[PDB]
Amino acid sequence: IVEGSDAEIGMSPWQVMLFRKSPQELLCGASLISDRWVLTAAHCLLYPPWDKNFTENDLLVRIGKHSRTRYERNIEKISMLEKIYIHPRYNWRENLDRDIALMKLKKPVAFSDYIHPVCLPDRETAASLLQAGYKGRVTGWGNLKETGQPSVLQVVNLPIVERPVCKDSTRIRITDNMFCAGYKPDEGKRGDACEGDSGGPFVMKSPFNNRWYQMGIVSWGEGCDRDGKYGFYTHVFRLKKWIQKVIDQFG
Amino acid sequence: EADCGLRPLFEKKSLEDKTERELLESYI
Amino acid sequence: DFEEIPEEYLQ
Ligand SMILES: C[C@@H](NS(=O)(=O)Cc1ccccc1)C(=O)N1CCC[C@H]1C(=O)NCc1cc(Cl)ccc1CN
Ligand SMILES: *[C@@H]1O[C@H](CO)[C@@H](O)[C@H](O)[C@H]1NC(C)=O
Ligand code: NA
Ligand code: NA
The one-letter code for the residue type at B28 is I
Chains that touch A (3 or more CB pairs under 8 A): B, C
The rounded distance, in Å, linking the Cα atoms of A111 and B12 is 13
Is the same domain home to A97 and A20? yes
User: Residue ranges of the alpha helices (H) in A88-239?
Assistant: 123-129, 163-168
**Domains of chain B, CATH where assigned:** 1-28 (4.10.140.10)
Q: Please state, in angstroms and rounded to a whole number, the distance separating the CA atoms of residues A160 and A203.
A: 11
CA pair distance A34, A230, nearest whole angstrom: 30
Cis status of the peptide bond prior to A49, with omega within 30 of 0: no
Rounded-to-integer distance, Cα A196 and Cα A175, Å:
23
- 3-class DSSP state of A154: strand
Distance CA A72, CA A76 (A): 5
Please, do chains B and A touch (3+ CB pairs < 8 Å)?
yes
Determine the 3-state secondary structure of A32 from DSSP. Answer: strand
Residues A45-79 as b or e (16 or more Cβ within 10 Å = b): bbbeeeeeebeeeebbbbbbbbebbebbeebbbbb
**Nearest protein Cα to ligand 2, atom 1:** A53
Q: Examine the domain organization and report whether A8 and A71 are in the same domain.
A: no
Q: Are A34 and A16 in contact (CB under 8 A)?
A: no
Distance (Å, whole) CA A62 – CA A17: 5
Report the CATH number at residue A2.
2.40.10.10
**Count of domains for chain A:** 2
- A185 lies in the same domain as A218: yes
Rounded to 5 degrees, φ, ψ at A62 are -120, 120
Q: Give CA–CA dist B12/A207, Å, rounded.
A: 16
**Phi, psi (deg, nearest 5) at residue A19:** -125, 130
CA A248 to CA A21: how far, in whole Å? 29
| Pair (A145, A243) in one structural domain | no
Pair A251, A182 in one domain: no
Of A21, A71, A78, the CB nearest to C3: A71
- Cβ-defined contact of A71 to C6 (cutoff 8 Å): yes
- Residue A95 and residue A41 share a domain: yes
Give the span between the Cα atoms of A71 and A152, in whole angstroms.
Answer: 12
Q: Domain range holding A100? A: 13-117+238-251
Residues A79 and A182 in one domain: no
Instruction: Count CB atoms within 10 A of the CB of residue C1.
Output: 9
- Kindly state whether A181 is in contact with chain B, defined as any CB-CB distance less than 8 angstroms: no
In one-letter notation, the amino acid at residue A149 is: Q
Question: Secondary structure of chain A: what % helix, strand, coil (to 5)?
Answer: 15, 35, 50
* A201 shares its domain with A233: yes
Among residues A62, A79, A200, A68, which one has the least CA distance to residue C2? A68
Residues with CB under 6 A from ligand 1: A 43, 47, 192-195, 198, 218-224, 231-233
DSSP annotation of C9 reads G
Tally of CB atoms within 10 A around A91: 15
> Chain A partners of B18 at a C-beta cutoff of 8 Å?
8
Q: Are residues A7 and A86 in the same domain?
A: no
- 3-state SS class at A191: coil
Work out the end-to-end distance of chain B between its first and last CA atoms, rounded to an integer number of angstroms: 28
Claim to verify: residue A96 and residue A151 sit in the same structural domain: no
Fill in the DSSP letter of residue A238.
Answer: G
Interface A-B, measured as beta-carbon pairs within 8 A, has a size of: 70
Among A12, A79, A169, A198, the one annotated catalytic: A198
A43 classed as catalytic: yes
Integer CA distances (angstroms), A119 to A51, A175, A213, B3, in order = 33, 24, 5, 9
Active site (annotated) includes residue A192: no
| Domain co-membership, A123 together with A201 | yes
User: From CA A116, how far away is CA B6, in angstroms rounded?
Assistant: 8
Looking at the DSSP bridge assignments, the partners of residue A81 are: A105
Q: How many CB atoms lie within 10 A of CB A122?
A: 12
Q: Which of A208, A105, A191, A209 is nearest to A154 (CA)?
A: A191
> For chain A, what's the residue count?
251
Do A37 and A111 lie in one domain? The reply is yes
